[PDB]
Design a binder for this molecule. Sequence first.
Ligand SMILES: *CCC(=O)NCc1ccc2[nH]ncc2c1
Length: 341
Amino acid sequence: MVRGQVFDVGPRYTNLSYIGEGAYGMVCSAYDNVNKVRVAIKKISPFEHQTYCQRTLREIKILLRFRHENIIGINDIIRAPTIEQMKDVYIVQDLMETDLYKLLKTQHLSNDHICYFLYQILRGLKYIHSANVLHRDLKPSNLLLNTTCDLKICDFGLARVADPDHDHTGFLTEYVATRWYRAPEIMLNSKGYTKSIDIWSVGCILAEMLSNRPIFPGKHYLDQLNHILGILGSPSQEDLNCIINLKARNYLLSLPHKNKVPWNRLFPNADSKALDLLDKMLTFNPHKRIEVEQALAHPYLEQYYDPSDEPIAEAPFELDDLPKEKLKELIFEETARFQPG
Ligand SMILES: *CCC(=O)NCc1ccc2[nH]ncc2c1
């Protein structure tokens, strides 16, 4: 029991402390009596809802398949021994001192810290993209950090397999990513099924590391594009011609001309190489946006870049029509390897 509710992690995990509430529910630290270290445990209660089943299953499947130093692992999964008795699932992960959201609320980052954090983000993202997966919700709170500034990407509940042939859609229809980290094309003509969607989010995170403030702090869904265009300025004729959908194109054409705000005026103390990479990640046109391997090779990251130590997935990667009964059964099968049974 923690703060009124059951938090039932068997005798293996004891001495619980509340960490906080996340996008799944309660998160605690606990002492792992087998490995003799404190661990993080998140309690998930998805089974009444098909969407929460979908996201819980996506995450478990992805994180059990992935193995990478900059991607949070699953150490253990606790649930009841039978489907009938299973109401909650607990996922045990490495304990990490903080996250980049909490860190940016109170700490100025040195240029060497921004450089190292950005390197680790892209190194992890390289592996994710190499598996043909899109994270689709990269943001500071999904970047865990320990006391020696090792970084691990978490939350794969909103991830998808990339599908660029089916990316196109209409105007003001799509809802991918968290608002401040959402690429302009999401509001214009994209379902968020290409790798470029994650690179935009990384760009936003880089900008936020430079000033401790979100770069495009849209106050609601419709406001987000105002902030993006307010800094990038009006898209070029070529970039507009890439938007074939008329509602999206004519919306952009209806706007008064806006000049680009130079990065060096917004970030007068930033490393000029960091601003060059920032510009390339926050490119309006997703086809011209830098890719993860290009980003790693950028002069800003030259102290760290080493492609032989930037591994790829061995094994690159249909839940929407599945009823929740079947997704419970799939979660039960996927978590069976952690049972004493
Ligand atoms: C991806 C966001 C998230 O799951 N935050 C909660 C969390 C997860 C893992 C962890 N390890 N140490 C602290 C935490 C917090």
